[PDB]
Ligand binder design. Structure first.
Ligand SMILES: O=C(c1ccccc1)c1ccc(-c2nc3ccccc3n2[C@H](C(=O)NC2CCCCC2)C2CCCCC2)cc1
Ligand SMILES: [Cl-]
Lengths: 230, 12
């Protein structure tokens, strides 16, 4: 029922690596400070996403057993999960508690950022559904590791090796849900069910980016590699 | 080709 000493060790380690990410307040302070044009917002997004990928690779190489995986499978896991982990981190930031009226302004700033109207509704639907789950930092960190270590990712040669690494993380997450939320018996299932929406964002990520209301869609060389752009 | 990703993975 309770976490074993090894599981407690795993969770603390995962949590320390996850906290190396750009602080949510740094991101929200910039967005809330002043209104930017769609052009300026697209550059903000590419700079934020480039830093996110850099930190994500560092978090990924620290996951137990990741560095023992086949090199081609390592690349396929990073490429298959980057967009998904980016949207999950965005959802985490969006739902972070802020002073009175600040969350409404943050949502208004994202709504008028430059993203096409067609993609605002599913993005905000996902953000609000994540918010309703009232996830802890541990849950976000474990869910991110689970997303990265997905065995059924495209071009994976050895799925069993990936399965073996994902399973102890799934086990820890399930225990946390049972311990901290006995009143919500479907909490674990709902966290995993939320991953299907993340996969839909990954499926249309290129169209979402190319539909931004800007004259030129300039991407960093790192984003060109991880995303299906240019 | 994914040379930047390969570099970030193989470094250190
Ligand atoms: O269109 C998007 C996209 C991105 C990648 C692939 C496909 C589509 C697409 C568009 C906005 C957001 C998005 N949802 C946010 C929720 C809360 C706070 C900021 C958020 N953002 C953007 C952001 O900086 N995201 C960071 C967050 C940390 C991890 C790296 C990404 C800014 C960009 C400046 C204007 C305002 C929103 C998230 C995503
Ligand atoms: Cl459960």
């Amino acid at each position: 029922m309770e976490l074993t000493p090894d599981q407690q060790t795993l969770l603390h380690f995962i949590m320390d690596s996850y906290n190396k990410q750009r602080m949510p307040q740094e991101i929200t302070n910039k967005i809330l400070k002043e209104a930017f044009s769609a052009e300026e917002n697209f550059l903000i997004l590419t700079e934020m996403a480039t830093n996110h990928v850099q930190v994500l690779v560092e978090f990924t190489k620290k996951l137990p057993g990741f560095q023992t995986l086949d090199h081609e499978d390592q690349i396929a896991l990073l490429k298959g999960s980057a967009v998904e982990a980016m949207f999950l981190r965005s959802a985490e930031i969006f739902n972070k508690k802020l002073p009175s009226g600040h969350s409404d302004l943050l949502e208004a700033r994202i709504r008028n950022s430059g993203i096409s109207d067609e993609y605002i509704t599913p993005m905000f639907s996902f953000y609000k559904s994540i918010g309703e789950l009232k996830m802890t930092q541990e849950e976000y960190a474990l869910l991110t590791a689970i997303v990265i270590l997905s065995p059924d990712r495209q071009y994976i040669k050895d799925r069993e090796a990936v399965e073996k690494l994902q399973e102890p993380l799934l086990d820890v997450l399930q225990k946390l849900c049972k311990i901290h939320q006995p009143e919500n018996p479907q909490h674990f299932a709902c966290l995993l069910g939320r991953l299907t929406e993340l996969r839909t964002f990954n499926h249309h990520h290129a169209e979402m980016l190319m539909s931004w209301r800007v004259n030129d869609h300039k991407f960093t060389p790192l984003l060109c590699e991880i995303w299906d752009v240019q | 080709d994914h040379q930047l990703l390969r570099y970030l993975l193989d470094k250190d």
